Design a binder for this molecule. Structure first.
Ligand SMILES: [Cl-]
Ligand SMILES: [Cl-]
Length: 205
């Protein structure tokens, strides 16, 4: 049974205990990146075995923007475009000092897709709440973006107001999902990513 730890070694969480930029980046780029590329490819193959409402193409964080503060986490992204991913909805598998997580992301620069998903959330609060109940322990990673070891809070906001903000503010963003263990099967992770399909699809239009 293929598992996340076959790609991302459990001990790699300690890379994120390296406080200095150069030292942490060396390990993120040298050791974690090749593994994330392999894992991203494999997850995309598995997802594409049963097509969903949008394509999934693999990407890996480039870390070309950081200078002084090392990344608190690194990730692969699965999104609808072959090259680039930050301008569109995507799912990601992340590793940092806290371990692994699987999240659904709309960055501030995904202006149009935030407008689309925000409008859906605003108009479909009850459907969002139903979905949230079904997926269990949904966390908001937004508030802990500056607290790498902190347990992210449960999503408790009103999706209608959150959606209104997400759609209308240039600096708004979404980052929600699940903490997962290193021994989780790839088959289980694929299904977790599929549970974001409702949001992924509604972001497109
Ligand atoms: Cl992009
Ligand atoms: Cl599993």
């Amino acid at each position: 049974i293929e598992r996340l730890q076959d790609y991302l070694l459990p001990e790699w969480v300690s890379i994120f205990d390296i406080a200095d930029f150069s030292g942490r980046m060396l390990r993120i780029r040298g050791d974690i990146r090749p593994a994330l590329l392999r894992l991203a490819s494999r997850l995309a193959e598995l997802l594409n075995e049963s097509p969903g409402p949008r394509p999934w193409y693999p990407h890996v964080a480039s870390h070309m923007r950081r200078r002084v503060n090392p990344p608190p986490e690194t990730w692969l992204a699965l999104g609808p475009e072959k090259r680039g991913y930050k301008s569109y909805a995507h799912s990601g598998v992340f590793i940092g000092g806290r371990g692994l997580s699987v999240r659904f992301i709309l960055k501030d620069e995904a202006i149009e897709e935030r407008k689309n998903l925000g409008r859906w959330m605003s108009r479909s609060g009850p459907a969002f709440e139903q979905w949230k109940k079904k997926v269990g322990d949904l966390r908001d990673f937004g508030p802990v973006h500056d607290d790498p070891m902190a347990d992210p809070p449960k999503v408790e906001w009103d999706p209608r107001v959150f959606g209104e903000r997400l759609g209308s503010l240039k600096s708004a963003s979404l980052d929600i999902g699940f903490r997962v263990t290193f021994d989780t099967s790839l088959a289980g992770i694929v299904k977790t990513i599929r549970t974001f399909d409702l949001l992924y699809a509604e972001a497109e239009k």
